[PDB]
Amino acid sequence: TCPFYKKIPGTGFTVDAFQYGVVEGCTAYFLTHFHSDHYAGLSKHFTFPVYCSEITGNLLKNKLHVQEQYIHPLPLDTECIVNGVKVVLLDANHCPGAVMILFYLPNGTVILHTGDFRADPSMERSLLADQKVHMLYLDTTYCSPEYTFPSQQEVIRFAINTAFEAVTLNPHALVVCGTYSIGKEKVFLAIADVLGSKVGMSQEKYKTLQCLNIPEINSLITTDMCSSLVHLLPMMQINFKGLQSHLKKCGGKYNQILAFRPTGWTHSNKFTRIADVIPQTKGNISIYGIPYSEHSSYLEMKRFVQWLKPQKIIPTVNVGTWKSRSTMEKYFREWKLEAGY
Ligand code: NI
């Protein structure tokens, strides 16, 4: 049975609600982005209308084989009518194709569902600027002050400089980057660009990347591992054993691996600056964990909400425990009292 925080009152609509069977009353199923916790339940046998971005629609069709007749892609930043209700899709600054959804209810209520997002001041000048929001369904993944991390730009700067240094010292080193889903493509694309290489990967991952409308992508990725000095591997293989095993397969072309694990937040963030990050090393293998996040830090979240000034907040993440729920509600009240809404 579908939880309340995935239902949109006054509509026949649900959000990211595909694992509950046929939802009683639902005339349209929205999908914010192509991550498995959110699409869980979709397959080629799904026969209800799915509304989403163009990029999400490319992945539904090519990776999950959803039939075309049930995929309804919408443009961003454009007022659209769905089953007689005005909606707008906005860029969520999450993974490729990720959106937030603005719903304009027949009774006059305006609701924003953020999906998964990394709040940014640029959002303060989208179509959000133009009217009031009554209810906010909020990605609260990192809703606690201990959650700090750097900008995406600082993290990429660290990775490019690290990789360029190592390979210039040793032209026989291989760089490997971990992946398990879409998102965080900048990590491997920025490193390959500084090294003048394409990124090599499996046929399944190449397929996924070809659905994402990235400009000039055919110039940047390949399935020919032998031609590439940046390789992508599943995140589970980014350990000393998995990497040793990969180095064996490269036929003596390389004698060193430098690997990156883009994580979300990790507690080494409470002490260390990005500049000071060091790898784990065993022999000719080094592994860097880098805090590249596609969710709001606590401060970015706070700033967005204090700017929007919603009448009610409904968290969508960390809702399973009473202590989490109580923690989040305390911060929401602080934010409201500090800003005066
Ligand atoms: Ni996500």
UniProtKB/Swiss-Prot annotation:
Transmembrane segments: none annotated. Keywords: Cell cycle, Cell division, DNA damage, DNA repair, Hydrolase, Isopeptide bond, Metal-binding, Mitosis, Nucleus, Phosphoprotein, Ubl conjugation, Zinc, Zinc-finger. GO terms for biological process: cell division; double-strand break repair via nonhomologous end joining; interstrand cross-link repair. Induction: During mitosis. The mRNA encoding this protein contains an internal ribosome entry site (IRES) in its 5'-UTR. This 5'-UTR generally suppresses translation while specifically promoting expression during mitosis, when cap-dependent translation may be impaired. One of its GO terms (molecular function) is damaged DNA binding. GO terms for cellular component: fibrillar center; nucleoplasm. It is found in: Nucleus. Expressed in brain, heart, kidney, liver, pancreas, placenta and skeletal muscle. Changing residue 139 to N: Impaired nuclear focus formation, reduced interaction with PIAS and increased sensitivity to cisplatin. Binds constitutively to TP53BP1. Binds CDC27, which is itself a component of the anaphase promoting complex (APC). Binds PIAS1. May be required for DNA interstrand cross-link repair. Also required for checkpoint mediated cell cycle arrest in early prophase in response to mitotic spindle poisons. Possesses beta-lactamase activity, catalyzing the hydrolysis of penicillin G and nitrocefin. Exhibits no activity towards other beta-lactam antibiotic classes including cephalosporins (cefotaxime) and carbapenems (imipenem). Belongs to the DNA repair metallo-beta-lactamase (DRMBL) family. This is DNA cross-link repair 1A protein. The lineage of its organism: Eukaryota, Metazoa, Chordata, Craniata, Vertebrata. The gene is DCLRE1A. The chain holds residues 700 to 1040 of 1040 of the full protein.
